[PDB]
Each structure stands twice: as structure tokens, then as C-alpha cells.
Design a protein around this nucleic acid. Sequence first.
DNA 1: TCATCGATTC
DNA 2: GAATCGATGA
Length: 145
Amino acid sequence: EFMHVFDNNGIELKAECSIGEEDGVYGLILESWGPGDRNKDYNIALDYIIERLVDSGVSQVVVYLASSSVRKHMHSLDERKIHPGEYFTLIGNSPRDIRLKMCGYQAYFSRTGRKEIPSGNRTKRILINVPGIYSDSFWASIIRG
DNA sequence: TCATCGATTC
DNA sequence: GAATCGATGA
């Protein structure tokens, strides 16, 4: 029922995802890692996604916190946007370093709202949007590799 | 049973 | 500072 991210050799990663419209935004949902081994390839998969997005000519995305807890308690979509600006930039560093920065922002969320000091898990359910992209074919080629 | 992120280990 | 574990409440 879930799709998955595949590595550069075409092997399926432990990283569930899905493509579609959620809360009015079209894009890729990456499921959370945990407990134990559930989606344990989250970071690897996310590095591949960033790398392939950059390769396809995408330089900026919008990323929203999409956990059940945050969707329930934070009704504003603008507040679920994990990064302070309108967009998050994918170029200017390695896919890994870009990912570290992207996921660092996830640590500013608790179950019920934002924190002052960031802490905790950084492998949460997230929605990634590429402005102007409304089609599953584009996202399909990103996760397929 | 289950996804949540705080807590612990790296 | 970040990867991984696993206690927790719905």
C-alpha cells in the first residue's frame, strides 16, 4: 500500500512514502522512522530524494511537518512549514549536509506545538512540495532513481 | 496494535 | 551535534 524509495542500484529501501495531495499541498510524504527498524533508511532515502531533485533542476522546496500529532495540534499550515522562509534551498552543499539542515528544523516541534530550544527526534513524517509540480510522474522518477 | 518524539547512545 | 532506541498514549 505504501510506495518506497529505491537506491542507486534499484534496491528497495526501508523507507515508505506516498505521492499526492495532503492538506491542499501536492508532493511526497516520507513516513517517520520508528520504533526500531520501521523505516530505518529514512535519512538515506531523504539524501537520495535531495540528490535527485537537484539533478532534475529543482533548487528549492517547501517542507511541512506532517505527523499525526502536529496535524492535530497545529492547525495552521504556515506553522507546520518547518523552515522559516518561504522555501528551503537544496543546492550549495552535499545532499547529506542539506538533509542535516532540513531535518534539524524538525527538532523545533513537539507533539503539541513549537519549542524554543530544539531537541529530540528528527526523522518525522514530512511533506515535500516542489512549487509548480502537481504530477505523480515527476515524483515517481525521484523515488525510483 | 500503532506512529509518536523524548531519551539514550553514537 | 546526530543516529538510533524504545516508552508512551491513543
